[PDB]
Amino acid sequence: QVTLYGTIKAGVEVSRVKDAGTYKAQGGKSKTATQIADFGSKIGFKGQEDLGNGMKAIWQLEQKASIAGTNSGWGNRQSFIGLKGGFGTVRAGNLNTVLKDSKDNVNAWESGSNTEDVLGLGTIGRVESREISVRYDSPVFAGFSGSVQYVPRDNANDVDKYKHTKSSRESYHAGLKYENAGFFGQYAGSFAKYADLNTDAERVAVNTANAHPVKDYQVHRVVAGYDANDLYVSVAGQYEAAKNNEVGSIKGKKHEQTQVAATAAYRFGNVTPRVSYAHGFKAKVNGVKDANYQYDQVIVGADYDFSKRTSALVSAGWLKQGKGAGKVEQTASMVGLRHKF
Amino acid sequence: QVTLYGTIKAGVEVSRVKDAGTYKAQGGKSKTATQIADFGSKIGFKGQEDLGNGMKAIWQLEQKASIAGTNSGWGNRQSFIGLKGGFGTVRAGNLNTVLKDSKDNVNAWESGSNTEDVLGLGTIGRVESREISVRYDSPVFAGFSGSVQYVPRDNANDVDKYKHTKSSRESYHAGLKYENAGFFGQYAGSFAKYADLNTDAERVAVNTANAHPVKDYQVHRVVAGYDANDLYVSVAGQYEAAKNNEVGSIKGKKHEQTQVAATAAYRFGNVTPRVSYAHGFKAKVNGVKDANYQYDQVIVGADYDFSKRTSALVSAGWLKQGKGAGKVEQTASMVGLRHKF
Amino acid sequence: QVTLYGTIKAGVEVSRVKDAGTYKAQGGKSKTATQIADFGSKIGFKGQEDLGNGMKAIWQLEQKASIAGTNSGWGNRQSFIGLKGGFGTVRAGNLNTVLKDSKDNVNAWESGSNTEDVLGLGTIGRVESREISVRYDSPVFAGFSGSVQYVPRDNANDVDKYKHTKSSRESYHAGLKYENAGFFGQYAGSFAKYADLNTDAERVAVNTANAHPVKDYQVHRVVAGYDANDLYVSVAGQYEAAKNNEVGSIKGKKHEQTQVAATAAYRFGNVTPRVSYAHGFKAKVNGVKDANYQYDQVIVGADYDFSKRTSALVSAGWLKQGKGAGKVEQTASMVGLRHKF
């Protein structure tokens, strides 16, 4: 039969930006923003049937479901149909990319969408997405699991099914994980010979306004540390690079940026203090060191677990972006509540 | 664990408007409108977990779900997360305003959206809404319960989190209820030092087209009668007032209107005849008696209860709005069916 | 109490169009389109309560729920409230038209929306729809069942409830079915004295851009064969006609087209090979034989049933539309998977 599940999560977030360019007030100070915000409440349906020969059918329909009433849609979170057996798992649908699944071991902070960059490691998680795709996941081979994912060209670009006037945006995603004696280490990455980027280095759909076409787009993520014995610690290294593919005098010219992230948390019975640091390095844009993309952020917080499904959350965030006169410093704090059903 | 619930309700409504200004036909008569209409079918999910120390976690996700297929969205009806214990209730989310909860004791008629003004006391219920908010509800103190609700400034106006260029639309909502020997009496009200209104005296979001900015916006509702022993009777008094806050020669100038409503119903086993009268008084707009907002409406109807969850509904509505040559008279009737699950 | 149900279905579809007018490449050949596509996954809620006197209350809320995340809305598939007893069934809501219910015995192919015309008998199913309506279904009288359905004028045209400036789009739908010794034969049809059509002969809402107003719009469907003993066979005949109702020199001038469809399938235990042919005849448009609407399509495929709720699907489609130089040939194939819960 079928299972219903979800997570409800919300809280109040206080936030303050200090931007020289956009803010009248002396110092460049914006005012306090005091807001009730949903942290991405979701609700889902999933089922499975045994087909007899050690093989199951699997499906999921998960949805964003903010308790502030700002969401609509079915299947807009990870949703699929698939088969599972001795050979492993195959799914097709609106699937978490391999790099998005690796978020658990990198970014565990709960946040409003307005504070996902300051109160969470949102910047390093700008390469996570959901894509319509087929995906394979291997069984666990003595602590080793792996996965491979592919986005078809015509799933990447519907307009051009029958007229390949635009280059293919087909993308490959792939991952290898190792867990043993609690210890964890994994590689996550993606490649697209052709892709498109926004100014925030997030990938955007082909034909989005102000999108910059790129070639040989590739992301590399590596995480390790581990998760057991009343303690968590992880570190992650992320590398991303592409080449300019906008005709003009910059075409073929090389983009890249390197990010690192560090998180540690220790559990005192029902209280789990946590700390996270992240660094966005110097960015090379069009083969030119560009300091606008460099950043330093630190998050501190803790979770009180009333039960194994209900937590209280608190956290504070410091974020500095760029260098020089065009600097943006974000500070925010939160108190919140979460329920998993 | 988790509960699923809802209400399905629909029927056919006949309606006829008699407006001098908008209608060609002699008398000013519009034609019969004969329509199948949803009366606001809804579907919801709610759960709760005991946290041990006489304290529960609570959540809800409720949605409009018209069986005519005109709704989309999650959490667009009362949805929240909260905590309940000996101290009472605290919720945060898309919450019924305190004045919206008081609708049960004032307006109990089921209706299409097109007939909510004639086949229900819709006019007096123009001050009911749902707002993103924190809300406290007191335990029942020997028949006395109370509640307090607040909308943050930055929840009232997202655009201006960091630039308080516009005045705060933060609002307070508050209520006191007393139930005893069946007898009921309650006060419901709200205050916003700054708010915005449409031409129909409904509150609208900041920056809505043709919205009139107001100051010291305050609503006052009072209801009493009671509900037991095969009989219901209630009466309600509503007062609303603000000051013009549109720069120009009218600013600071005073708005107000007073409404009264009366309902009685007696139950003959499985049939519950009901009657309702409402009066919208002379309106003072910009300190000037304005008769356009005055109205008189009467509703008569009954409910046959096939079961405690399935009812048949019938009702007829007479509505007269304004005075003079610019008069609008609405007549409508309905037959319907409702199922609570 | 209440039931949850649905169907999850998706697969990969390959498709190729060969159009002289729209395609550069020599032959007129478009390129392969290789796509992951949802075949119309849906999810629904339904319940019923006994009212005692051999009579039940019934409701449904069904929704499109593509696992590619492209759907939003509640009640956008067949949703209703109703009563059922010895006398039969009455429903009111977003109801399947009588002709849409007859699709099971005519078109059983699962498909993406982009391939519903080639990998399914989509063309003959251009007269199926869901309309806000009241509907009666008769009990089975010795193999005979019948149904009647009506769309109110003001449900057909909301804008004009009170100003009948536009002619009524009220429509009647009606059907008679006979099942016995497995044998099945049924009549399905609809009539609207006034209606509107798109260029693809699909009915569109009043005031849709490029809609052609028609009068005496009527559809006639007839199906027979039968469904038992390890074998299925059906044949269907469809007739549709109207008169031009666009003022201009063509008004009153007569439209019509005749379609026929043929399907046979035999079950080899868990494998059900199937074949379907369909023919769209010469069309008379404005009383003028027009060959653009003529077509010939054939589908071959089979279903492997892992269980009684999980199937694997395969099919291939050939479609030729029109005659002459303005000819469109579509070829497509699919492999897919379906789960009914």
Short mmCIF file of N, CA, C and O in Angstrom, two decimals, chain C residues 190-274:
data_model
loop_
_atom_site.label_atom_id
_atom_site.label_comp_id
_atom_site.label_asym_id
_atom_site.label_seq_id
_atom_site.Cartn_x
_atom_site.Cartn_y
_atom_site.Cartn_z
N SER C 190 -23.25 14.36 -28.12
CA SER C 190 -23.53 15.67 -27.48
C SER C 190 -24.15 16.63 -28.49
O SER C 190 -23.91 16.47 -29.72
N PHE C 191 -24.90 17.60 -27.99
CA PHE C 191 -25.47 18.66 -28.84
C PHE C 191 -25.36 20.00 -28.12
O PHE C 191 -25.61 20.09 -26.91
N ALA C 192 -24.97 21.02 -28.88
CA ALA C 192 -25.01 22.42 -28.44
C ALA C 192 -25.50 23.24 -29.63
O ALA C 192 -24.84 23.23 -30.69
N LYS C 193 -26.64 23.90 -29.46
CA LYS C 193 -27.20 24.77 -30.52
C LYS C 193 -26.14 25.82 -30.87
O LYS C 193 -26.01 26.13 -32.07
N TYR C 194 -25.39 26.31 -29.89
CA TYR C 194 -24.26 27.24 -30.14
C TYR C 194 -23.01 26.73 -29.43
O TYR C 194 -23.12 26.35 -28.26
N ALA C 195 -21.89 26.73 -30.15
CA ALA C 195 -20.57 26.32 -29.63
C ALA C 195 -19.46 27.01 -30.42
O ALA C 195 -19.76 27.72 -31.39
N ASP C 196 -18.21 26.77 -30.02
CA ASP C 196 -17.03 27.38 -30.68
C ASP C 196 -15.94 26.33 -30.89
O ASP C 196 -15.76 25.48 -30.02
N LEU C 197 -15.21 26.44 -32.00
CA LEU C 197 -14.20 25.43 -32.39
C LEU C 197 -12.86 26.10 -32.67
O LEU C 197 -12.81 27.24 -33.18
N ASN C 198 -11.79 25.36 -32.41
CA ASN C 198 -10.43 25.75 -32.84
C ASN C 198 -10.17 25.13 -34.22
O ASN C 198 -11.08 24.45 -34.74
N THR C 199 -8.99 25.37 -34.78
CA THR C 199 -8.64 24.93 -36.16
C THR C 199 -8.50 23.41 -36.17
O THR C 199 -8.69 22.81 -37.24
N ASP C 200 -8.22 22.81 -35.00
CA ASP C 200 -8.06 21.34 -34.85
C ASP C 200 -9.41 20.69 -34.51
O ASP C 200 -9.42 19.55 -34.05
N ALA C 201 -10.52 21.38 -34.74
CA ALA C 201 -11.88 20.83 -34.56
C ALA C 201 -12.16 20.52 -33.09
O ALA C 201 -13.24 20.00 -32.80
N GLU C 202 -11.23 20.84 -32.19
CA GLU C 202 -11.50 20.75 -30.73
C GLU C 202 -12.42 21.92 -30.37
O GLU C 202 -12.26 23.02 -30.93
N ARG C 203 -13.36 21.68 -29.47
CA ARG C 203 -14.19 22.75 -28.88
C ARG C 203 -13.34 23.60 -27.94
O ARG C 203 -12.61 23.06 -27.11
N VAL C 204 -13.49 24.91 -28.03
CA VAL C 204 -12.77 25.85 -27.14
C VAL C 204 -13.78 26.76 -26.48
O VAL C 204 -14.91 26.88 -26.98
N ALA C 205 -13.34 27.37 -25.39
CA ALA C 205 -14.17 28.27 -24.57
C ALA C 205 -14.57 29.46 -25.44
O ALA C 205 -13.82 29.83 -26.37
N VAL C 206 -15.72 30.04 -25.13
CA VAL C 206 -16.17 31.29 -25.81
C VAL C 206 -15.11 32.35 -25.52
O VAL C 206 -14.67 32.44 -24.37
N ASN C 207 -14.74 33.11 -26.55
CA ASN C 207 -13.82 34.27 -26.42
C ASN C 207 -12.36 33.81 -26.40
O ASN C 207 -11.51 34.64 -26.05
N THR C 208 -12.07 32.58 -26.81
CA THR C 208 -10.67 32.16 -27.04
C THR C 208 -10.23 32.75 -28.37
O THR C 208 -11.06 32.78 -29.31
N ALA C 209 -8.98 33.19 -28.44
CA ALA C 209 -8.41 33.79 -29.66
C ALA C 209 -8.48 32.79 -30.82
O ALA C 209 -8.12 31.62 -30.62
N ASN C 210 -8.92 33.26 -31.99
CA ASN C 210 -8.95 32.45 -33.23
C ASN C 210 -9.95 31.30 -33.10
O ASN C 210 -9.74 30.25 -33.73
N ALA C 211 -11.00 31.47 -32.30
CA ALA C 211 -12.09 30.49 -32.20
C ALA C 211 -13.13 30.86 -33.25
O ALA C 211 -13.42 32.07 -33.40
N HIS C 212 -13.68 29.85 -33.92
CA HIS C 212 -14.72 30.00 -34.96
C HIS C 212 -16.09 29.62 -34.40
O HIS C 212 -16.32 28.44 -34.10
N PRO C 213 -17.02 30.59 -34.22
CA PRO C 213 -18.34 30.30 -33.66
C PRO C 213 -19.14 29.38 -34.57
O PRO C 213 -19.12 29.58 -35.77
N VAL C 214 -19.80 28.39 -33.98
CA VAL C 214 -20.63 27.44 -34.77
C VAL C 214 -21.99 27.31 -34.11
O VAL C 214 -22.17 27.77 -32.96
N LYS C 215 -22.90 26.72 -34.88
CA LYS C 215 -24.31 26.53 -34.50
C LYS C 215 -24.64 25.07 -34.81
O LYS C 215 -24.02 24.50 -35.73
N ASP C 216 -25.56 24.50 -34.05
CA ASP C 216 -26.02 23.10 -34.22
C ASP C 216 -24.82 22.16 -34.22
O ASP C 216 -24.74 21.27 -35.09
N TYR C 217 -23.93 22.36 -33.25
CA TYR C 217 -22.76 21.48 -33.06
C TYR C 217 -23.23 20.16 -32.42
O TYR C 217 -23.93 20.19 -31.39
N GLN C 218 -22.87 19.04 -33.04
CA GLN C 218 -23.36 17.71 -32.60
C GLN C 218 -22.31 16.65 -32.89
O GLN C 218 -21.75 16.62 -34.00
N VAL C 219 -22.08 15.80 -31.91
CA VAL C 219 -21.10 14.70 -32.07
C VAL C 219 -21.84 13.39 -31.85
O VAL C 219 -22.72 13.36 -30.96
N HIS C 220 -21.49 12.38 -32.64
CA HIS C 220 -22.11 11.04 -32.59
C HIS C 220 -21.03 9.97 -32.57
O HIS C 220 -20.23 9.90 -33.53
N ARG C 221 -21.03 9.16 -31.52
CA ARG C 221 -20.05 8.07 -31.39
C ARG C 221 -20.80 6.77 -31.17
O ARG C 221 -21.84 6.76 -30.47
N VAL C 222 -20.28 5.72 -31.79
CA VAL C 222 -20.86 4.36 -31.72
C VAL C 222 -19.70 3.39 -31.67
O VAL C 222 -18.80 3.48 -32.54
N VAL C 223 -19.74 2.51 -30.69
CA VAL C 223 -18.65 1.51 -30.49
C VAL C 223 -19.25 0.15 -30.22
O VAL C 223 -20.29 0.07 -29.51
N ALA C 224 -18.56 -0.88 -30.70
CA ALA C 224 -18.95 -2.27 -30.43
C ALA C 224 -17.80 -3.23 -30.70
O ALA C 224 -16.77 -2.82 -31.26
N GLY C 225 -18.03 -4.48 -30.32
CA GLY C 225 -17.03 -5.57 -30.32
C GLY C 225 -17.19 -6.29 -29.01
O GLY C 225 -18.31 -6.18 -28.45
N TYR C 226 -16.17 -6.97 -28.48
CA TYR C 226 -16.14 -7.15 -27.01
C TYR C 226 -14.83 -7.68 -26.42
O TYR C 226 -13.83 -7.97 -27.13
N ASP C 227 -14.95 -7.78 -25.09
CA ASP C 227 -13.91 -7.69 -24.04
C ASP C 227 -14.13 -8.86 -23.08
O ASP C 227 -14.85 -8.66 -22.07
N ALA C 228 -13.59 -10.03 -23.39
CA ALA C 228 -13.60 -11.20 -22.48
C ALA C 228 -12.87 -12.37 -23.11
O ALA C 228 -12.57 -12.30 -24.31
N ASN C 229 -12.63 -13.40 -22.31
CA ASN C 229 -12.13 -14.70 -22.79
C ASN C 229 -10.74 -14.51 -23.42
O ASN C 229 -10.52 -14.99 -24.56
N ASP C 230 -9.86 -13.78 -22.73
CA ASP C 230 -8.42 -13.69 -23.10
C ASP C 230 -8.27 -12.79 -24.35
O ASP C 230 -7.12 -12.68 -24.85
N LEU C 231 -9.34 -12.16 -24.83
CA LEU C 231 -9.34 -11.40 -26.11
C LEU C 231 -10.19 -10.13 -26.02
O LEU C 231 -11.28 -10.17 -25.40
N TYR C 232 -9.72 -9.07 -26.69
CA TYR C 232 -10.48 -7.81 -26.88
C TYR C 232 -10.55 -7.46 -28.37
O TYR C 232 -9.55 -7.60 -29.11
N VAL C 233 -11.72 -6.98 -28.79
CA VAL C 233 -11.87 -6.38 -30.14
C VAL C 233 -12.95 -5.31 -30.10
O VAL C 233 -14.06 -5.59 -29.58
N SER C 234 -12.66 -4.13 -30.66
CA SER C 234 -13.68 -3.06 -30.78
C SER C 234 -13.53 -2.28 -32.08
O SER C 234 -12.40 -2.15 -32.64
N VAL C 235 -14.67 -1.76 -32.51
CA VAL C 235 -14.74 -0.83 -33.65
C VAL C 235 -15.66 0.33 -33.30
O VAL C 235 -16.71 0.10 -32.65
N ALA C 236 -15.29 1.50 -33.79
CA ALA C 236 -16.02 2.73 -33.45
C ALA C 236 -16.22 3.59 -34.69
O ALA C 236 -15.30 3.65 -35.56
N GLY C 237 -17.37 4.24 -34.71
CA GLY C 237 -17.74 5.19 -35.76
C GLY C 237 -18.12 6.51 -35.15
O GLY C 237 -19.00 6.55 -34.26
N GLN C 238 -17.49 7.59 -35.62
CA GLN C 238 -17.77 8.93 -35.04
C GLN C 238 -18.15 9.91 -36.14
O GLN C 238 -17.44 10.02 -37.17
N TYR C 239 -19.23 10.63 -35.88
CA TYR C 239 -19.72 11.68 -36.80
C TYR C 239 -19.88 12.98 -36.04
O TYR C 239 -20.51 13.01 -34.97
N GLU C 240 -19.37 14.05 -36.64
CA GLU C 240 -19.46 15.40 -36.04
C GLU C 240 -19.80 16.39 -37.15
O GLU C 240 -19.29 16.25 -38.28
N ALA C 241 -20.67 17.34 -36.82
CA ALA C 241 -21.11 18.37 -37.78
C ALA C 241 -21.63 19.61 -37.06
O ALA C 241 -22.15 19.51 -35.94
N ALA C 242 -21.50 20.73 -37.74
CA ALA C 242 -22.05 22.02 -37.28
C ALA C 242 -22.23 22.93 -38.50
O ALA C 242 -21.92 22.48 -39.64
N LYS C 243 -22.74 24.13 -38.24
CA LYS C 243 -22.87 25.20 -39.25
C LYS C 243 -22.03 26.39 -38.81
O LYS C 243 -21.97 26.73 -37.61
N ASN C 244 -21.37 26.99 -39.79
CA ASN C 244 -20.66 28.27 -39.59
C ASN C 244 -21.59 29.28 -38.92
O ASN C 244 -22.75 29.41 -39.35
N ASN C 245 -21.09 29.98 -37.92
CA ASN C 245 -21.88 31.03 -37.24
C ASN C 245 -21.04 32.29 -37.05
O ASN C 245 -21.34 33.07 -36.13
N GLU C 246 -20.02 32.46 -37.89
CA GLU C 246 -19.24 33.71 -37.94
C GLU C 246 -19.84 34.59 -39.04
O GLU C 246 -19.85 34.17 -40.24
N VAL C 247 -20.35 35.76 -38.64
CA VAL C 247 -20.95 36.71 -39.61
C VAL C 247 -19.86 37.10 -40.60
O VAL C 247 -18.65 37.32 -40.22
N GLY C 248 -20.29 37.19 -41.84
CA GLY C 248 -19.43 37.16 -43.02
C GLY C 248 -20.13 36.27 -44.01
O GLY C 248 -21.24 35.80 -43.69
N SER C 249 -19.48 36.00 -45.13
CA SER C 249 -20.15 35.43 -46.32
C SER C 249 -20.23 33.91 -46.24
O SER C 249 -20.72 33.30 -47.20
N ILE C 250 -19.75 33.34 -45.14
CA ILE C 250 -19.64 31.86 -44.96
C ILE C 250 -20.69 31.39 -43.96
O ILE C 250 -20.88 30.17 -43.86
N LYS C 251 -21.36 32.31 -43.28
CA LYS C 251 -22.29 31.99 -42.18
C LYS C 251 -23.36 31.03 -42.69
O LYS C 251 -23.71 31.12 -43.87
N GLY C 252 -23.80 30.11 -41.83
CA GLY C 252 -24.85 29.13 -42.16
C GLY C 252 -24.31 27.96 -42.96
O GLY C 252 -25.04 26.96 -43.11
N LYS C 253 -23.07 28.05 -43.43
CA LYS C 253 -22.46 27.06 -44.36
C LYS C 253 -21.94 25.87 -43.53
O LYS C 253 -21.51 26.08 -42.37
N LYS C 254 -21.99 24.66 -44.08
CA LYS C 254 -22.00 23.42 -43.26
C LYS C 254 -20.61 22.77 -43.13
O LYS C 254 -19.94 22.51 -44.14
N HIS C 255 -20.25 22.44 -41.88
CA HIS C 255 -19.07 21.63 -41.50
C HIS C 255 -19.47 20.19 -41.17
O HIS C 255 -20.61 19.97 -40.67
N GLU C 256 -18.58 19.24 -41.45
CA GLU C 256 -18.72 17.86 -40.91
C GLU C 256 -17.42 17.08 -41.12
O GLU C 256 -16.62 17.47 -41.99
N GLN C 257 -17.24 16.02 -40.32
CA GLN C 257 -16.19 14.99 -40.57
C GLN C 257 -16.55 13.67 -39.91
O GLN C 257 -17.16 13.66 -38.82
N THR C 258 -16.16 12.58 -40.57
CA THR C 258 -16.44 11.21 -40.10
C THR C 258 -15.13 10.51 -39.80
O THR C 258 -14.21 10.53 -40.66
N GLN C 259 -15.08 9.89 -38.63
CA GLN C 259 -13.91 9.11 -38.20
C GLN C 259 -14.33 7.69 -37.89
O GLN C 259 -15.47 7.45 -37.40
N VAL C 260 -13.41 6.78 -38.17
CA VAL C 260 -13.59 5.36 -37.77
C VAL C 260 -12.31 4.88 -37.12
O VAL C 260 -11.20 5.36 -37.49
N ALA C 261 -12.48 3.94 -36.19
CA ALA C 261 -11.36 3.41 -35.39
C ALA C 261 -11.59 1.93 -35.13
O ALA C 261 -12.78 1.52 -34.94
N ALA C 262 -10.49 1.19 -35.11
CA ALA C 262 -10.50 -0.28 -34.95
C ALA C 262 -9.34 -0.72 -34.08
O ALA C 262 -8.18 -0.32 -34.35
N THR C 263 -9.64 -1.52 -33.07
CA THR C 263 -8.63 -2.02 -32.12
C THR C 263 -8.91 -3.49 -31.83
O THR C 263 -10.10 -3.86 -31.63
N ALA C 264 -7.83 -4.27 -31.79
CA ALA C 264 -7.88 -5.67 -31.34
C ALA C 264 -6.65 -6.00 -30.52
O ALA C 264 -5.53 -5.54 -30.87
N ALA C 265 -6.85 -6.78 -29.47
CA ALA C 265 -5.77 -7.22 -28.57
C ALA C 265 -6.10 -8.62 -28.05
O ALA C 265 -7.28 -8.89 -27.74
N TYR C 266 -5.08 -9.46 -27.99
CA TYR C 266 -5.17 -10.83 -27.42
C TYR C 266 -4.12 -10.95 -26.33
O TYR C 266 -2.97 -10.48 -26.52
N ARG C 267 -4.51 -11.58 -25.23
CA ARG C 267 -3.65 -11.74 -24.03
C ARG C 267 -2.99 -13.13 -23.95
O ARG C 267 -3.70 -14.15 -23.84
N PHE C 268 -1.66 -13.15 -23.95
CA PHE C 268 -0.85 -14.38 -23.81
C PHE C 268 -0.38 -14.45 -22.36
O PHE C 268 0.83 -14.22 -22.12
N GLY C 269 -1.30 -14.73 -21.44
CA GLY C 269 -0.97 -14.85 -20.00
C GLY C 269 -0.71 -13.48 -19.40
O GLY C 269 -1.68 -12.85 -18.95
N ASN C 270 0.55 -13.03 -19.42
CA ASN C 270 0.98 -11.71 -18.86
C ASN C 270 1.36 -10.71 -19.96
O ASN C 270 1.67 -9.56 -19.61
N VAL C 271 1.32 -11.11 -21.22
CA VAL C 271 1.63 -10.20 -22.36
C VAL C 271 0.37 -9.99 -23.18
O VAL C 271 -0.24 -10.96 -23.60
N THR C 272 0.05 -8.74 -23.45
CA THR C 272 -1.17 -8.39 -24.18
C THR C 272 -0.79 -7.61 -25.41
O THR C 272 -0.79 -6.38 -25.39
N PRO C 273 -0.41 -8.28 -26.51
CA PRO C 273 -0.29 -7.58 -27.77
C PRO C 273 -1.59 -6.84 -28.12
O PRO C 273 -2.67 -7.29 -27.77
N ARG C 274 -1.43 -5.70 -28.77
CA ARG C 274 -2.57 -4.86 -29.21
C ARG C 274 -2.24 -4.25 -30.56
O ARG C 274 -1.05 -4.00 -30.87
#
